[PDB]
């Protein structure tokens, strides 16, 4: 029952995620069933890539194109589908695609759960390699789909990062 | 996971919804859904040193002449994350007999909208030939080892068969 | 899914139901089970570099002294699913002190309809001195790099303790 | 690797050693090393849905009648390093018949200064039946989707058989 | 022992590739030191993608940069680093990069390993979705190297590939 | 052929390590024969816990006890065994157990290789986490080995390490 799934702690400074794939997983996008609380598979790809973190959404949040807002997780150790991790938000991978604009949330686990993470506030306090390798994931990942293209544009700042998530919250209420 | 929240289908038996039990590669522990509790029960662990040749689970709402909802293994490569919903392509049914009676699996693909793969695979054989072998196989020997049980394969069923299986297991389950 | 519809066993303390959390290899995450929500919520990442010696998970409907349902590590060989359910029996008790208090996780193997190969284990000491060596020897020290977290083992408790251990568990939940 | 600089063993054939080719676990993709280059060259992709039910490999300085050197199947539970060394102790021989006539797997277990796990393992008898019939289903089985090839099991050689069929090829080689 | 493996039973029709990297593989980059009989790292590589089959190098041989040709085993399953197998070479990747001209001879399992290529005898015979997963690696997997840059061009067929076996073959003489 | 493997191109800075067991493998340990060129099973353990690093050996070095210097290679990427690869020491994990001393040096993938551990040149300059993790495996995973105990002492910084690499070279003369 995701209706029970707080959207956070203190909003925006933690935000729970509900992990729909992990950080080594095939190109294969699963999108999470709210009435059935299911993954359903929603498209195989084909490119030789594996999803760079751990990926999955926020509850109660809205995104301009009415979904919930998804979340790049960047740590290293697979996490289980379905399950809920609190994270800090850092920042957001800003891109254009064919039906406008895509963004998706950069965080690492809170602090609580961890220590590993524990002094990264900002995206530029993640190690470079490690931010490519988020961005050219979503990048690249559809590029054997017809037609389908991805700009990456300026990464937000962790202030920009918890500003969207608010809009977000606000506009599922 | 809320089961009645899942249909059978869009335009069943055209297309049916499978929940995944276990992946492709997957070790012989057979794996099967609590309707209530939405939740995946281990029901018995084999010892052949083998592996599921598709993507298994089973489809919603539907029912068997024995009482369960009908099988069917997804014959895509990939594995699936058990739980998950896949939509499919019904293409055949691997018929075969046992210590019980009738054991019938449908074979399936995924369906167009998921990916081109398998777009103009229609029938069982359409697939390759190795996959066919692969599946039979599998289901045919991975309760060797269980004592007294055997296992004969009979004559696959086509996609127009493995059709009016699927409306005869809806029928049976309203 | 809902823990509401998983029974605490058929016959408990004889057999209990266990909701895996983390497969027999995994690296050790902890989690705490959302009850009203009915998913695993992430507690603690740890970092020693272990692996579980069974799959572990906890039975529901059931209240330890400090207030969470009994764990169980079943020590069998093969990796099962993160959130499937075993039937178990229950063969004994890992009994620690830590910077908590008393701590007792629950041996057991699965349950006789499941598979033949633990049949004849009731009582952890049926089991081979070296898995009862790994399960100590990961409780001792999966948290030694966790700050003031230390574990001292204990005597193990026999399977007549494991019962009324499970059956406290139980009461103490209602 | 230099396989001249390999022996036997120190006391054959109460230990041998063993080049390891295909890890427990491992897809049946056969693969035979080559002395000359003491690589391993693959010999057969296979297509049955099965897992090598123990590590597999030969021992040098060997030769069977049919001019290879003697394989052998260690039949501990983790896998171990493609084209590494391991000393074993032969309990055993999986006797069988097939297409080119006779065909015979050594049985081995890990000698006792590697590991206690297997001291007091002497004959195959002495092993887990289901591990045998876990080793016999996979040899009568693997290559049942090879066009026209057959295999039967026949009776299996106790340890006095196991070591006299080492030491004949022991001295064939010469 | 390097030299106690042949180029083939009868090249070009077959080759033995020494396998460095497996399909799905993450990539690194190895030399072959000849003398130590050892594969020696050269290049971690970080992008999040996956050789798109087995792939690996033909000893005795040389290209005009002096490496010994490189061929990608477009099978499904994952072969141990260090092995030989013996393949049917069916077509060249031909690409651009900032050394100039780069090619990769695609190949096929022979067919005494296992019928399931016995019909696959040009790059045209695979299915094309395989053709362009194994040009997007090739294309995008040195993307997070400052200033690596690759261009496709045009695939050479099976003739082709013959051809450019046999020219190395006698390169390296 | 190890003797074709040189101790590095400018020792103590840099070395090459023969790979033995890769990171997060099972505790079983392996042992390199000279004359074979190949991995001998030396023993099993039964402590459930994995390799926190690439482990080797650098070949033509050799400690008082007379076996080749030890070293581990703390990266996460998992290596092939029998592969070399040239590394930065940058510590010593000092340890006493039964036999006495035994230290075994700390380094990272050398920055011709990555751009990964540029900076990294002390041990104190790795993540507090990685050297706990390091000293933790090297502590317990000989626990239920009978009468076998291990001690971990004051690490030792990159000097101390380029030090005890250059006594082992000589030591090997």
Same mark, same amino acid.
């Given at each position: 029952?995701? @209706?029970? %799934?707080?959207?956070?702690?203190?909003?925006? &400074? @933690?935000?729970?995620?509900?992990?729909?794939?992990? #950080?080594?997983?095939?190109? /294969?996008?699963? &999108?999470?069933?709210?009435?059935?609380?299911? =993954?359903?598979?929603? !498209?195989? $790809?084909?490119?030789?890539?594996?999803?760079?973190?751990?990926?999955?959404?926020?509850? +109660?949040?809205?995104?301009? @194109?009415?979904? *919930? /807002?998804?979340? $790049? #997780?960047?740590?290293?150790?697979?996490? %289980?589908?379905?399950?809920? /991790?609190?994270?800090?938000?850092?920042? #957001? =991978?800003?891109?254009?695609?064919?039906?406008?604009?895509?963004?998706?949330?950069?965080?690492? *686990?809170?602090? +609580? =759960?961890?220590?590993?993470?524990?002094? /990264?506030?900002?995206?530029?306090?993640? *190690?470079?390699?490690? $931010?490519?390798? %988020?961005?050219?994931?979503?990048?690249?990942?559809?590029?054997? &789909?017809?037609?389908?293209? #991805?700009?990456?544009?300026?990464?937000?700042?962790?202030?920009?990062? !918890?500003?969207?998530?608010? &809009?977000?919250?606000?506009?599922?209420?």
């Amino acid at each position: 029952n995701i @209706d029970a %799934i707080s959207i956070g702690s203190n909003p925006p &400074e @933690d935000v729970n995620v509900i992990i729909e794939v992990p #950080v080594g997983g095939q190109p /294969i996008k699963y &999108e999470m069933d709210k009435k059935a609380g299911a =993954l359903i598979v929603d !498209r195989f $790809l084909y490119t030789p890539m594996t999803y760079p973190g751990n990926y999955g959404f926020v509850p +109660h949040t809205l995104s301009e @194109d009415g979904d *919930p /807002i998804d979340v $790049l #997780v960047c740590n290293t150790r697979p996490l %289980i589908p379905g399950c809920v /991790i609190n994270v800090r938000p850092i920042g #957001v =991978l800003v891109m254009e695609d064919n039906s406008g604009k895509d963004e998706k949330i950069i965080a690492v *686990p809170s602090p +609580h =759960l961890t220590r590993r993470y524990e002094k /990264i506030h900002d995206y530029t306090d993640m *190690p470079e390699i490690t $931010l490519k390798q %988020i961005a050219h994931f979503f990048e690249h990942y559809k590029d054997l &789909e017809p037609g389908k293209w #991805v700009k990456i544009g300026d990464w937000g700042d962790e202030d920009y990062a !918890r500003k969207f998530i608010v &809009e977000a919250i606000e506009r599922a209420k």
